[PDB]
Each structure stands twice: as structure tokens, then as C-alpha cells.
Amino acid sequence: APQQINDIVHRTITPLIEQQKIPGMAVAVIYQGKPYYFTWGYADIAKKQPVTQQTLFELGSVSKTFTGVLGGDAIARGEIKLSDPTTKYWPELTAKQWNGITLLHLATYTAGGLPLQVPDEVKSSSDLLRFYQNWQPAWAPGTQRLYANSSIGLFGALAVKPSGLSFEQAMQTRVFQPLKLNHTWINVPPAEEKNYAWGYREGKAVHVSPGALDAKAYGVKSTIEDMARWVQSNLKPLDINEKTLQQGIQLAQSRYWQTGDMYQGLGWEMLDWPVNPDSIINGSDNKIALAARPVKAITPPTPAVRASWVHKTGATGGFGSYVAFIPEKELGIVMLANKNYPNPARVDAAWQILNALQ
Ligand SMILES: OB(O)c1cc2ccccc2s1
């Protein structure tokens, strides 16, 4: 890589790793649209397996960006509309509190206080129907944003219904494959197990716990090379050959709601560029990021703004991930770690790097 990229990455990420005691890390910097890769440490401590360009990391909630884009793609295909009632695609969801709750609300966490987590006891299809049928809202739809797996997870599940495909097969065939994300999986196949990093929590090797809607809300595993391609695809959507996917990526970066200085897309979150770094750093702390916030509708949504900081944090028990990019500058970063460390440290590091290079 150019010396300036190597310099800021080494001065920023290498000490971050020491500070946070991260066992293994992969970073990609996209600069003038071209990817550069950086690796540290071990994918598997016990086996002394190094992190490589081939190492799969758990993306955690960075998966929500794939769900958002898949949903965007279904819209572009004319299969779903965000204005449609949730009940249009789940006719058995008949309970009165769902009247007025649309796919937009599910996708953007604005249904009125759907919970962060589906309770662990909720497993089967019948359990899931019961949970949503019994759920009572904290607020009217389209008034408050509460970041929630139960919200966007259900959006992902319903978005694929008209296609008839499973969520996994829609994602594979409509997003991963056209973008040549050849080492990106919702379910890691046996052939990839040797490349699947262990996560580390309290010094113990761990992989993500199964859950209802895991595939839709936090279930993607990917390599640093595939994630760099994901960034390139989101930096320059109108260069993707598949027309509905091009549009789907664009729709996921539309601004649907505003809270403070942030805007909610489909999976992606956005701020106007240039940003106050303290806003994104402090704003990424879970005490803010998981709190209810009042939203103003952007009526109608602003199409993807090139002058944006577009980003998403992700965590599982054993992994911490971050992706951020600025389409105007053809600039982006992916940080994948096999320890879950605080969000503000990730964002701070990403800001130092991208602000040096913009
Ligand atoms: O990485 B995300 O922001 C997630 C938040 C939660 C909360 C509970 C369970 C699983 C997840 S993934």
C-alpha cells in the first residue's frame, strides 16, 4: 500500500489491538476505490492459526446491512413495498396492534418498540407467531426508533416471501453471488470451517449462539476480502451490473428518518459529511445506540447522499466489527476483530484513518 495508508493504519490499529487485547484482526482500507489489506494475530489461538485474507469473522449486526440491501433488491424487483402493511406478507399476523405497522417501520426500527432481542425461549415458527401476536407497542408507529433485532429480523423474513425463496437462498443468489462474495455465509459449510475464526469472550473460544431470526439480524460471516468488495459495492452502486441490486443498494442508503445528526437507512446508518467525530464516536456507545430516540420522518426519503459518512457497528459474543465509508471520497474501511470490544474505540480508530486519507 501507499506509505500514507500504511502509516496511519499502523499508528492507529496496531495500538488499538494492544489496548483492547484483541487476539486477531483484519482491516481493509478502500482508497480511491482500491482495497488494501492488513492483518494481525491469530484466528485460532490454541492452533496458532494466523488471521489471513481468507479468515471468516462473525459480522454480527453488520449483517443488517446485507438484510437491508436484500430488502432494497426486493423493492426494486417490484416484490414488496415499504409502504405495505406487515400483514400483507404475513396474513396470519392478525392482532389489532399491527394495523398501521408497515415494512418501513420494521426495517428502520420504528414500529413502536419491538424489542432488541427476541426472548431466548422463542424458537419455533409457532413461538414466533405467538410472540408477535402478543407484542404490545410502547409507542405509535413511526414515532420512535428503538434499535431491534425483532424489527429488522422480521423485515428480512417478510421481504423474501413473494420470491418464495428461503432467506438464505435469496441472500446467496441475489446479493452474495452477483457481488462475488464467494467466502461469505449465513451458514458456514464444512469446507470453510478451517478458515472460520474463533471469537474470544473471557478468554474462551466461542461462536455465535443460535437464535430466532439470527440469519436476518446478525448471522453473516465473511472475510476481509469479501467485506472490502461489500464496501466497494456500496461506495459505487451504479457500477453494479444487476439492475435491481444496484437499486437495492441505493435504496438502503436512502434517508428515511432523522434523529439528532443521524439518519436511518435500511441497515446502514448515515450522517452528512463532514461529520463531528465526537458525534459518531460518542453516538456509537450502546448507552445511546440502544436507547429509544424520537424520529423525524424524512418525507419523502432523501436518495443516497454521496457526501455522507455511511456506517454500521456489529458485535457477537466473541467478535467486534465495523464498516464505514464516504461515497464522495471513494473511501472506506472494514475492521474485523475476534473479540467484542467497545464501539467508540472502533469508530475513533476508523475516523483517524479515514480523516487522514480524505
Ligand atoms: O451486533 B448487533 O448490534 C446485535 C445486537 C444484539 C442483541 C442481542 C442478540 C444479538 C445481537 S446482534
Side-chain angles (χ1 to χ4, degrees):
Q3 186 272 345
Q4 67 170 144
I5 300 173
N6 283 343
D7 185 43
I8 194 62
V9 172
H10 189 38
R11 285 185 291 108
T12 310
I13 305 297
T14 306
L16 176 69
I17 289 168
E18 294 305 304
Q19 286 148 201
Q20 301 292 156
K21 308 165 183 184
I22 296 168
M25 186 146 189
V27 168
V29 172
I30 295 63
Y31 178 74
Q32 296 181 6
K34 295 181 179 180
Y36 303 93
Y37 303 102
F38 310 82
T39 60
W40 298 256
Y42 292 131
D44 181 326
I45 296 173
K47 299 185 161 193
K48 291 172 176 77
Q49 288 309 119
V51 176
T52 68
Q53 294 164 106
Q54 293 86 30
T55 300
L56 286 79
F57 291 79
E58 297 177 358
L59 299 184
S61 297
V62 171
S63 303
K64 295 177 170 69
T65 70
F66 289 91
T67 299
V69 169
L70 182 67
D73 177 85
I75 300 157
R77 286 170 183 269
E79 291 178 346
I80 63 172
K81 307 175 172 167
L82 293 171
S83 60
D84 279 331
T86 297
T87 303
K88 183 179 187 70
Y89 314 92
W90 200 357
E92 29 281 290
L93 188 68
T94 50
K96 66 192 179 179
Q97 69 273 20
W98 288 92
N99 302 142
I101 302 180
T102 65
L103 295 186
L104 172 65
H105 297 135
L106 298 177
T108 57
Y109 323 117
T110 53
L114 282 169
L116 176 58
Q117 317 188 43
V118 179
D120 278 25
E121 296 83 359
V122 174
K123 295 179 181 179
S124 70
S125 298
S126 54
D127 289 343
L128 204 68
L129 173 61
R130 194 188 205 159
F131 170 77
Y132 288 110
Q133 279 288 77
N134 274 161
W135 167 82
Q136 298 294 333
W139 307 287
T143 64
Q144 313 292 338
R145 182 189 177 276
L146 177 69
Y147 182 81
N149 292 338
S150 69
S151 193
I152 192 166
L154 179 59
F155 172 72
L158 305 183
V160 298
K161 288 290 184 191
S163 77
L165 307 170
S166 67
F167 185 83
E168 179 177 24
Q169 285 303 318
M171 185 70 78
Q172 271 282 350
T173 60
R174 298 177 164 194
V175 183
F176 297 169
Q177 290 165 22
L179 299 175
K180 299 188 182 175
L181 308 185
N182 294 352
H183 301 280
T184 296
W185 295 98
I186 286 160
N187 291 294
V188 180
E192 290 269 49
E193 290 180 7
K194 66 186 206 299
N195 286 316
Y196 184 12
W198 285 101
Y200 292 91
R201 186 179 192 263
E202 293 179 4
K204 292 181 180 181
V206 293
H207 281 147
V208 63
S209 306
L213 308 168
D214 58 8
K216 293 94 180 180
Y218 57 87
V220 181
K221 298 91 197 184
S222 189
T223 69
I224 201 68
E225 293 190 344
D226 283 7
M227 293 302 293
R229 283 190 74 87
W230 184 236
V231 171
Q232 293 176 311
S233 299
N234 283 270
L235 276 166
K236 291 280 190 199
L238 310 176
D239 288 340
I240 291 150
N241 287 320
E242 294 78 13
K243 289 178 174 176
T244 60
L245 186 52
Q246 176 190 115
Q247 302 169 78
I249 295 170
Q250 274 287 281
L251 299 171
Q253 281 172 61
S254 289
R255 294 139 171 238
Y256 299 91
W257 302 97
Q258 183 172 4
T259 166
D261 63 356
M262 67 95 81
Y263 302 90
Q264 183 61 55
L266 310 175
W268 293 116
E269 294 166 24
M270 293 85 50
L271 297 90
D272 288 310
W273 173 266
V275 318
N276 179 0
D278 291 324
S279 190
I280 55 172
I281 297 159
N282 298 341
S284 76
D285 194 300
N286 282 344
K287 73 177 162 38
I288 290 167
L290 305 181
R293 287 291 183 269
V295 282
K296 180 176 183 69
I298 306 304
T299 302
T302 305
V305 174
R306 298 213 350 125
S308 296
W309 177 277
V310 187
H311 75 157
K312 186 73 187 83
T313 56
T316 59
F319 290 84
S321 65
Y322 187 56
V323 173
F325 60 92
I326 305 154
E328 189 185 73
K329 306 293 194 189
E330 318 183 307
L331 180 69
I333 193 173
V334 181
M335 298 158 60
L336 306 178
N338 63 353
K339 180 179 181 196
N340 176 24
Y341 64 107
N343 290 319
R346 317 184 194 170
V347 182
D348 201 322
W351 175 256
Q352 304 313 135
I353 292 160
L354 299 191
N355 201 45
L357 300 172
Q358 59 91 190

